[PDB]
Amino acid sequence: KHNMKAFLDELKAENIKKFLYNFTQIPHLAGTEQNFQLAKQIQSQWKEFGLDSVELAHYDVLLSYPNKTHPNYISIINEDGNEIFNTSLFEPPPPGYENVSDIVPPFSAFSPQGMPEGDLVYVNYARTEDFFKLERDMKINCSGKIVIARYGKVFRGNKVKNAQLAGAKGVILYSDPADYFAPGVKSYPDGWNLPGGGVQRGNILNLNGAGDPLTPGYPANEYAYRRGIAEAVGLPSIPVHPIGYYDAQKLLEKMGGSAPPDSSWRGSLKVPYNVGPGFTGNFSTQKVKMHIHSTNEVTRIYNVIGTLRGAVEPDRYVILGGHRDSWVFGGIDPQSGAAVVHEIVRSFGTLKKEGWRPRRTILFASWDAEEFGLLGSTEWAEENSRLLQERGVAYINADSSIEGNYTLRVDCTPLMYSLVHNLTKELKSPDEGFEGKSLYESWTKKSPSPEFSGMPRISKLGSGNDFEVFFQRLGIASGRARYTKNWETNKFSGYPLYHSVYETYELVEKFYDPMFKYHLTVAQVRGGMVFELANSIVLPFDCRDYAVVLRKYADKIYSISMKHPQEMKTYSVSFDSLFSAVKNFTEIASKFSERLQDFDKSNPIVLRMMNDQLMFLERAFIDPLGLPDRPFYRHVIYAPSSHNKYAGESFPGIYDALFDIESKVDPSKAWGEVKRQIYVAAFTVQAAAETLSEVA
């Protein structure tokens, strides 16, 4: 029998382990030779695994690298101009890698060059509300100051944007042990915590879905016409650099000026967490100096694209994609995901060698330059946009398979909720205490839905990964799954060794998943989703689940507006049209579901009409005009939060029109824009509903 069970049983923990080891012995930084060689290896292996074609798709995109002979660092300087304290030039390498070459030192990718000198202001997490607190309540002016911010809570790019708009002349990012040192656990190599010399790499762009900064809208191919740097998308205007907490303690310990406004501003170091500006009396003439000499340069990147042609609907694509480029060894991010994809390809290929093909075509992708802004996935999607929007059934992401070892994490479109519930009921739980029980059962017990008893938590898709182009630009139903930590104790800043040199094969094998059972469970979830999407006769999407969430989101956004009852009266702000559209969607979706159950099962045209209606439903939520000042965020229901790229926001156009509205100087204009966004949302919901009506 060639069925899902055969596919799933072929997957092996031991193969995932072997592949992870293979992928994490040297760094695979985007645009370097080592990552091209890995691309070529994966191409070769996918061909031997049995795929029909496997090609490299390359692009020439803007990347960023430190200058090897002019290192980045930060100083405290006295009034004479002597540098009395310098931050580290590199992370101490882990045991047995102290001779590995080409470890990129910590830096903030895409920082401009500069050597700004000034007084330090401490800005907590550099969130929108942190800056509101400084400027509006505490009356502290960041203009011309160097800000120091702790990592965590939001994407680092949003921190940098927020500091720029506050008038900062540079940003220092650091990892506080409050956020990256779990109590009771040892620092690497003796446990999974961040040492004081550890530093988190990461880009600080604000691309809003654009892809390569120089070529928004179009692939960065050989004849592409590039923007000049001054017109590039998303580059920061001020220098930025990340440090560890040993170094941060030295910059923070002398801070003076105002006390922290409350305890939510204090991390775990032995310093006051004074906001500044500047240092206490005895050190008041000392300053902080940054030295940033990184360079942006157009560099070639390589995606691997594998095809397993469908037997019946070869013009329908189900995509499994995840990235290959890493900051250093990529022990978790991304190779724990890449090894899972590799084993999925192997298992599908085993069935293929026995004569099986999926119903629909499956595309497998090893993306490049994800770490530098989702560049590889976005350029490929830009190149192939027409194929994807008319043929794209679904995209399943495959970055890190683990961020913890407690339970499952799923973020996806509502169209996949039913598919995920049904699949996880057929999979075995890997969890201690749930031997012989389903993954659905363990997941639901450990991560209960906040709404519905007996159901598990499934989150909105946010961003900060390679699904963004597919979901928020093109409107292709998308999802992701991985193992995670306890939601109850989750402080939402990720695992301690994120984007550090310490993220190694040994981290995973010793401390996260020694038996590779959580990896195997994630391979079964990702692979099983792909299998069902590519082989089910009727696409496994339930439109009724979108109806339920649309009502929840309408209730939410209405509740936000209702904090302003006087203005809603004055400006005649009604949500009636949106609730009407959501009611109609609910009714039409119910009727479509009945037909889908009842239609003549012998009629392949009626089936395809209904499969096309299902495929184009996510597509219907796209507005070709995009969201305000974010033309590549086109989905009307979901966009990455304007304050935090990692978080999904629902009804984003109305949300942003309402945000901080009490502060706008022209309320008539501001509430007019709220009404405009309500109209756009109600229209889009009704238009999406109508795609599920009888076609003629």
Ligand X SMILES: *[C@@H]1O[C@H](CO)[C@@H](O[C@@H]2O[C@H](CO)[C@@H](O)[C@H](O)[C@H]2NC(C)=O)[C@H](O)[C@H]1NC(C)=O
Ligand Y SMILES: *[C@@H]1O[C@H](CO)[C@@H](O[C@@H]2O[C@H](CO)[C@@H](O[C@@H]3O[C@H](CO[C@H]4O[C@H](CO)[C@@H](O)[C@H](O)[C@@H]4O)[C@@H](O)[C@H](O[C@H]4O[C@H](CO)[C@@H](O)[C@H](O)[C@@H]4O)[C@@H]3O)[C@H](O)[C@H]2NC(C)=O)[C@H](O)[C@H]1NC(C)=O
Ligand Z SMILES: *[C@@H]1O[C@H](CO)[C@@H](O[C@@H]2O[C@H](CO)[C@@H](O[C@@H]3O[C@H](CO)[C@@H](O)[C@H](O)[C@@H]3O)[C@H](O)[C@H]2NC(C)=O)[C@H](O)[C@H]1NC(C)=O
Ligand U SMILES: *[C@@H]1O[C@H](CO)[C@@H](O)[C@H](O)[C@H]1NC(C)=O
Q: Is 453 annotated as a binding residue?
A: no
Cβ atoms < 10 Å from Cβ of 6:
15
Q: Which of residues 237-266 bind a copy of itself (CB under 8 A)?
A: none
208 touches Ca ion (CB under 5 A) = no
Cis, bond preceding 277 (omega within 30 deg of 0): yes
Residue 105 in tokens? 């030192």
449 touches ligand Z (CB under 6 A) = no
Q: How remote is the C-alpha of 134 from its chain's centroid? A: 29
Count of residues in contact with a copy of itself, rule CB under 8 A = 53
Q: CA-to-CA distance for 62 and 59, rounded, in angstroms?
A: 10
Residue 305 in tokens? 């694209």
Residue number, 615 or 681, with CB nearest to ligand Y: 681
Annotation marks residue 612 as catalytic: yes
> Which of 383, 148, 93, 390 is CA-nearest to residue 287?
148
Residue number, 212 or 333, with CB nearest to Zn ion: 333
Annotation marks residue 9 as catalytic: no
Convert residues 432-471 into a mask of x (bound to Cl ion by CB under 5 A) and - (unbound): ----------------------------------------
Q: Phi first, then psi: what are they for 674, rounded to 5°?
A: -55, -50
Cβ atoms < 10 Å from Cβ of 264:
10
**Among residues 318, 557, 670, 678, which is the contact residue for a copy of itself, using CB under 8 A?**
678
Q: Is 545 annotated as a binding residue?
A: no
Does residue 326 contact residue 27 with C-beta atoms inside 8 Å?
A: yes
Residue number, 223 or 559, with CB nearest to ligand Y: 223
Residue 647 in tokens? 């978080």
**Among residues 3, 295, 603, 693, which is the contact residue for ligand X, using CB under 6 A?**
295
181 touches ligand U (CB under 6 A) = no
Shortest CB 411 distance to a copy of itself, Å = 25
> Which of 123, 136, 130, 202 is CA-nearest to residue 168?
123
User: Beta strand pairing status for 287-291 and 73-77?
Assistant: antiparallel
Shortest CB 396 distance to a copy of itself, Å = 18
- Of the residues 253, 612, 623, 673, which is catalytic? 612
Type of residue found at 48: E
Q: Is 370 annotated as a binding residue?
A: yes
Residue 295 contacts which entry, a copy of itself, Cl ion, ligand X, none (Cβ below 5-8 A, type-dependent): ligand X
Q: CA-to-CA distance for 476 and 132, rounded, in angstroms?
A: 36
User: Beta strand pairing status for 240-243 and 170-174?
Assistant: parallel
- Supply the angle between the helices 335-353 and 517-535 in degrees, to the nearest 10: 50
Q: Phi first, then psi: what are they for 121, rounded to 5°?
A: -115, 130
584 touches ligand Y (CB under 6 A) = yes
Q: CA-to-CA distance for 254 and 257, rounded, in angstroms?
A: 10
Residue 333 contacts which entry, ligand Z, Zn ion, Cl ion, none (Cβ below 5-8 A, type-dependent): Zn ion
Q: CA-to-CA distance for 13 and 345, rounded, in angstroms?
A: 14
Residue 480 contacts which entry, ligand Y, Cl ion, Zn ion, none (Cβ below 5-8 A, type-dependent): Cl ion
Q: Which of residues 203-222 bind a copy of itself (CB under 8 A)?
A: 217-219, 221
334 touches Zn ion (CB under 5 A) = yes
Q: In 354-427, which ranges are continuous DSSP H helix?
A: 375-383, 385-391, 417-424
Q: CA-to-CA distance for 560 and 556, rounded, in angstroms?
A: 6
> Which of 499, 191, 484, 146 is CA-nearest to residue 289?
146
**Among residues 22, 258, 350, 459, which is the contact residue for ligand Z, using CB under 6 A?**
22
Annotation marks residue 28 as catalytic: no
**Among residues 75, 366, 686, 691, which is the contact residue for ligand Y, using CB under 6 A?**
686
Q: CA-to-CA distance for 202 and 353, rounded, in angstroms?
A: 41
- Of the residues 91, 247, 343, 370, which is catalytic? 370
Q: Phi first, then psi: what are they for 512, rounded to 5°?
A: -100, -50
Q: Which of residues 507-526 bind a copy of itself (CB under 8 A)?
A: none
User: Beta strand pairing status for 240-243 and 108-109?
Assistant: unpaired
- Of the residues 635, 642, 649, 650, which is catalytic? 635
> Which of 500, 112, 60 is CA-nearest to residue 294?
112
Residue number, 55 or 451, with CB nearest to a copy of itself: 55
Stretch that binds ligand X, among 23-31, 62-70, 465-473, 627-635 (CB under 6 A): 62-70
225 touches a copy of itself (CB under 8 A) = yes
Shortest CB 406 distance to ligand Z, Å = 26
Q: CA-to-CA distance for 511 and 523, rounded, in angstroms?
A: 19
Residue number, 202 or 479, with CB nearest to ligand Z: 479
Shortest CB 221 distance to Ca ion, Å = 9
Helix or strand or coil: residue 482? strand
- Of the residues 44, 237, 574, 590, which is catalytic? 574
Q: How remote is the C-alpha of 384 from its chain's centroid? A: 22
CA distance between the termini of the chain = 40
Residue 198 contacts which entry, ligand X, Zn ion, Ca ion, none (Cβ below 5-8 A, type-dependent): none
Shortest CB 327 distance to Cl ion, Å = 16
Strand ranges, E, within 30-158:
53-65, 73-77, 83-86, 108-109, 117-118, 120-122, 146-150
Type of residue found at 249: Q
**Among residues 312, 515, 537, 538, which is the contact residue for a copy of itself, using CB under 8 A?**
312
212 touches Ca ion (CB under 5 A) = yes
404 touches ligand U (CB under 6 A) = yes
143 touches ligand X (CB under 6 A) = yes
Q: Which of residues 392-411 bind Cl ion (CB under 5 A)?
A: 397, 399
Annotation marks residue 574 as catalytic: yes
Does residue 58 contact residue 320 with C-beta atoms inside 8 Å?
A: no
> Which of 480, 508, 534, 417 is CA-nearest to residue 4?
534
Helix or strand or coil: residue 458? coil
Stretch that binds ligand Z, among 403-411, 418-426, 436-444, 628-636 (CB under 6 A): 418-426
Q: CA-to-CA distance for 327 and 31, rounded, in angstroms?
A: 11
Count of residues in contact with ligand Y, rule CB under 6 A = 10
141 touches ligand X (CB under 6 A) = yes
- The DSSP code for 399 is S
- Binding site, by residue number, is 156, 203, 215, 218, 323, 333, 370-371, 379, 382, 399, 463-465, 480-482, 498-499, 645-646
Q: Which residues bind Ca ion (CB under 5 A)?
A: 211-212, 215, 220, 382
The residue ranges that bind a copy of itself (CB under 8 A) are: 52, 217-219, 221, 223-225, 307, 309-310, 312-315, 317, 361, 383-387, 390-391, 576-577, 604-605, 608-609, 612-613, 616, 619-620, 623-625, 631, 672, 675-676, 678-680, 682-683, 687-688, 690-691, 695-696
Which residues contribute to the site for ligand U (CB under 6 A)?
Answer: 192, 404-405, 511-512
Q: Which stretches of the chain bind ligand Z, using CB under 6 A?
A: 22, 25, 41, 44-45, 83-86, 418-419, 422, 540, 542, 597
What residues make contact with ligand X under the rule CB under 6 A? 67, 69-70, 141, 143, 295
Interface residue list for ligand Y (CB under 6 A): 55-56, 58, 222, 577, 580-581, 584, 682, 686
Residues interacting with Cl ion, by CB under 5 A? 397, 399, 480
Mind telling me the catalytic residues?
A: 370, 574, 612, 635
